[PDB]
Design a protein around this ligand. Structure first.
Ligand SMILES: *[C@@H]1O[C@H](CO)[C@@H](O[C@@H]2O[C@H](CO)[C@@H](O[C@@H]3O[C@H](CO[C@H]4O[C@H](CO)[C@@H](O)[C@H](O[C@H]5O[C@H](CO)[C@@H](O)[C@H](O)[C@@H]5O[C@H]5O[C@H](CO)[C@@H](O)[C@H](O)[C@@H]5O)[C@@H]4O)[C@@H](O)[C@H](O[C@H]4O[C@H](CO)[C@@H](O)[C@H](O)[C@@H]4O[C@H]4O[C@H](CO)[C@@H](O)[C@H](O)[C@@H]4O)[C@@H]3O)[C@H](O)[C@H]2NC(C)=O)[C@H](O)[C@H]1NC(C)=O
Ligand SMILES: CC(C)(C)OC(=O)N1CCN2C(=O)c3cc(-c4ccc(Cl)cc4F)ccc3NC(=O)[C@H]2C1
Ligand SMILES: [Ca+2]
Ligand SMILES: [Cl-]
Ligand SMILES: [Zn+2]
Ligand SMILES: [Zn+2]
Length: 806
């Protein structure tokens, strides 16, 4: 029960939640069955429409009307948004030439520029050019404010996961909303778009914008609107709130539209029936902007126009069914659609074996429109593993496709031509961002960015201190006229050692051999200087990376490379080298194929040994700086030092050798030299963060040599490619990857062919931001450049997608 029969009179859309069992007069009361008897009557008026007409101007105030055209209307703060246009001969906001907003132009009482979030659902990024003829208001915001060509959602590209990421600056794995449908195995409860479970606060983690504001003394408008409340009402409600007295008036507001997503599901992203939903949205933006112009706020408010995700062509006939792959289809549960998630049907069966499930789903059809992963082996750029609500088995589905359990689920559980939720680098999933206001720049285009980054920015605009999030604060400073935030480099925690020659050959008993005895007054002081760092500014162009945790490590210098060697992990944390466009590839000579040499700078005790790799049949080794790319036969001996050595599965050595022998030189060709930094990553617990010495779960058999989970590389050159990588005067260009280090190549269905048909496709799939690598290594790159630090934080958030132009 709820004794809900008090009044809403004078309380229509109040900002507080009053104590039960009283009656409420806010957006959630409809959802909670808690509204006052008169709520509909008073708080949802519709009489006479939403627009003034020439025969209403200066009328008798009739309280029952939806909005007003009377003389007192501006004072009451409740006119129809076109009241000035009809009754006072003022022009629409779209019709005015935009004039730069050099300073905020706010009425008295207004301490700071308000922020209005205008969020639109399923608004595909290509709509801004393709629908530009039927969206004159939106086009003005875009062209006069600050806009990206598109904005990147988070995976899965679904509604609830994206709205709450916008709200928090968190990955879905961190905020807890990992899909529109979820099973928590500890709650033993399910979360769905339909029903009541979603109303409990235990699902929603992190701290969203409106809570962050509240706790810091900034009043917030609503971020939930009933579907039944028409969009015209939503706007007048926001405009009413802006009219309130100073100490009652919120600083941050939200408007949400269900369109164009609701139609895109029925008609597909470009159906002819899509023109009217785009017409609708542009009117609502017109109404808001005319409304702000009325109350003198259109040169004072910051507006964000933003989408949750895009929309792809998807139909029933493009459904892959699991019952065509698995005999035991009734011992699994599947979360279906544009992404697949599998768990056991019953916890009782300990016979349920994820390995057999994955084996049956791997490369079984030449056409296969999905690929199975254990969640820990998904690309790290999706950050979709670390939550108990994400099932162990995941299916990445091809764009334009679906997966289901059995055919009966499709025709009795065709009505649709659109869907979304695919991999977040897929063009059709990209969405929009426009910023318009005093605090944004004027007629400015910025590079595409991720939606995780907007939390920090909306905090700046409101003078708040952002709760801990996954954005990189400072990386979007270039969108703003003036910044609240001045970013600074983290301090180095561990300074390196610089060992000289301290050990004799005969002190080592590592089980390694090499043909290196056969070998001057000229050349001895030449290669002396290389071990002392004479060519440090050739192979290490942006400073040594900084180690941001407490450890024990050595810098080691060579003619062709320089490395950060960990005494704790017995292998380098990072290896840096520059391959110029002129450089040549050469082969490993017959006598040096088994060559591994002790390093006289590093002790036998803090060194790897050949014996452990001999003992381990499953485990061979590779090298971080590639022998193939040695600058001279004399130099090559450096590449074989035991301190350049890393553990690698034979299967992985195939991917690695082809990267080192073919791809590095080809990049150097295209990019006018490249500088590469490569290293191991240890993330056994898949939280996306480096693992400490006492979290290692795998060692090369009988050794203390830890086994990396991934291997990374960062590849940097000059954005103006007419300048060589190592003599670049301005901005830089980068691409990176995080290869999973796996004992098989089951992920690449074509792997039995030559490496040239598959390896590059694999690396493309595991593309990465420098910032992802920093989280996983505890390192900090690009310490010493000529570029501003804001420009460097942008560089670090960059992701090279290998998609063609939108
Ligand atoms: C993206 O950004 C986010 C935010 O910055 C990063 O996530 C943070 O990472 C931290 C490191 O993992 C983590 O810090 C821990 O916090 C513990 C307290 O946790 C609660 O309080 C915070 C603060 O309000 C709150 O945010 C948390 O919310 C989580 O949990 C609730 C309910 O369960 C969820 O509703 C919510 O969605 C969120 O879940 C997420 O995080 C949990 C873990 O917290 C995951 O399991 C989920 O999958 C989900 O992603 C909590 O309510 C604190 O107690 C910890 O301190 C222990 O550990 C450290 C390190 O050893 C140490 O300093 C302490 O001594 C202490 O040790 C004790 O526990 C150890 C482990 O069992 C053990 O070794 C000892 O024996 C001790 O008993 C710890 O500091 C922080 O909570 C999250 N924040 C969020 C919001 O997720 C994220 O990493 C970033 N991602 C990337 C890729 O960079
Ligand atoms: C109603 C119930 C399901 C109980 O939960 C709620 O009320 N929420 C659940 C969480 N939430 C959201 O994440 C949410 C975010 C946005 C949003 C959009 C863009 C930008 Cl730049 C920032 C944002 F914040 C818009 C609309 C929205 N819609 C909601 O519904 C609210 C409140
Ligand atoms: Ca980790
Ligand atoms: Cl889902
Ligand atoms: Zn959506
Ligand atoms: Zn949708």
């Amino acid at each position: 029960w709820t004794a809900t029969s008090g009044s809403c009179k004078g309380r229509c859309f109040e900002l507080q939640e009053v104590g039960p069992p009283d009656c409420r007069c806010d957006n959630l009361c409809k959802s909670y069955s808690s509204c006052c008897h008169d709520f509909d009557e008073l708080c949802l008026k519709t009489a006479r429409g939403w627009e003034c007409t020439k025969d209403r101007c200066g009328e008798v105030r009739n309280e029952e009307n939806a909005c007003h055209c009377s003389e007192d209307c501006l004072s009451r703060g409740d006119c129809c948004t076109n009241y000035q246009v009809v009754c006072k001969g003022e022009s629409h906001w779209v019709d005015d030439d935009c004039e730069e907003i050099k300073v905020p132009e706010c009425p008295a009482g207004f301490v700071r520029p308000p922020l209005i979030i205008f969020s639109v659902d399923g608004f595909r990024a290509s709509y801004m050019k393709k629908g530009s003829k039927v969206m004159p208001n939106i086009e003005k915001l875009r062209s006069c404010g600050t806009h990206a060509p598109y904005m990147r959602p988070v995976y899965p590209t679904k509604t609830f996961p994206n709205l709450y990421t916008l709200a928090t600056g968190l990955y879905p794995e961190s905020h807890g909303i990992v899909g529109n449908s979820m099973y928590d195995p500890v709650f033993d409860a399910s979360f769905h778009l339909r029903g009541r479970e979603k109303f409990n606060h235990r699902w929603w983690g992190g701290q969203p914008l409106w809570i962050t504001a509240t706790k810091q003394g900034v009043r917030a408008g609503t971020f939930f609107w009933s579907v039944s409340i028409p969009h015209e009402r939503r706007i007048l409600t926001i405009l009413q709130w802006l009219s309130l007295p100073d100490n009652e008036r919120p600083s941050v507001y939200a408007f949400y539209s269900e369109q164009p997503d609701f139609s895109g599901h029925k008609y597909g992203p470009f159906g002819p029936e899509m023109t009217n939903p785009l017409r609708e949205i542009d009117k609502t933006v017109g109404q808001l902007m005319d409304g702000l112009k009325q109350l003198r706020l259109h040169r004072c408010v910051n507006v964000i126009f933003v989408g949750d995700h895009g929309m792809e062509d998807v139909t029933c006939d493009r459904t892959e069914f699991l019952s065509n792959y698995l005999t035991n289809v009734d011992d699994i549960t599947l979360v279906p659609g544009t992404l697949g998630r599998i768990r056991a049907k019953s916890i009782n069966n300990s016979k349920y074996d994820p390995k057999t499930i994955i084996a049956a789903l791997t490369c079984k059809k030449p056409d296969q429109h999905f690929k199975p992963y254990m969640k820990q082996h998904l690309p790290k750029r999706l950050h979709y593993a670390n939550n108990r609500r994400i099932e162990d088995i995941h299916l990445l589905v091809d764009r334009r496709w679906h997966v289901a359990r059995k055919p009966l689920d499709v025709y009795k559980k065709c009505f649709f031509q659109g869907d979304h939720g695919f991999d977040n680098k897929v063009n059709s999933m990209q969405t929009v961002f426009v910023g318009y206001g005093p605090t944004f720049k004027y007629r400015t285009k910025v590079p595409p960015f991720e939606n995780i980054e907007l939390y920090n920015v909306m905090c700046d605009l409101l003078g708040l201190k952002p709760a801990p999030n996954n954005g990189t604060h400072g990386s979007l400073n270039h969108l703003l006229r003036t910044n609240t935030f001045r970013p600074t480099m983290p301090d180095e925690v561990s300074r390196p050692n610089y060992p000289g020659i301290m050990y004799l050959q005969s002190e080592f008993d590592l089980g390694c051999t090499c043909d290196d005895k056969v070998e001057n007054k000229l050349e001895e002081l030449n290669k002396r200087l290389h071990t002392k760092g004479s060519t440090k500014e050739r192979h290490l162009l942006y400073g040594r990376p900084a180690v941001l945790y407490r450890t024990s490590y050595d810098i080691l210098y060579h003619t062709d490379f320089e490395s950060g060697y960990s005494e704790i992990f017995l292998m380098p944390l990072w290896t840096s080298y520059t391959i110029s466009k002129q450089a040549e590839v050469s082969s490993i000579p017959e006598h040096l194929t088994n060559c591994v040499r002790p390093d006289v700078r590093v002790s036998p005790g803090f060194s790897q040994n050949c014996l452990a790799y001999k003992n381990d049949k499953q485990m061979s080794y590779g090298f971080l700086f590639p022998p193939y790319l040695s600058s001279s036969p004399e130099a090559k001996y450096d590449a074989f030092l035991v301190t350049n050595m890393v553990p690698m599965y034979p299967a992985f050595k195939r991917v690695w050798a082809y990267f080192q022998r073919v791809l590095v030189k080809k990049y150097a060709s295209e990019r006018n030299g490249v500088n590469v930094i490569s290293g191991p990553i240890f993330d056994y617990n898949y939280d996306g963060l480096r693992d400490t010495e006492d979290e290692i779960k795998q060692y090369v058999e009988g050794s203390s040599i830890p086994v990396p989970t991934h291997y990374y590389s960062i590849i940097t050159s000059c954005l103006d490619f007419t300048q060589p990588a190592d003599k670049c005067d301005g901005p830089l260009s980068v691409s990176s990857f995080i290869l999973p280090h796996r004992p098989d190549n089951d992920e690449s269905c074509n792997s039995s062919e030559d490496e040239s048909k598959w390896v590059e496709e694999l690396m493309k799939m595991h593309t990465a931001r420098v910032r992802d690598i920093e989280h996983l290594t505890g390192l900090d790159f690009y310490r010493k450049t000529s570029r501003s630090y804001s420009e460097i934080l942008t560089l670090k958030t960059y992701l090279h997608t290998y998609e063609s132009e939108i």
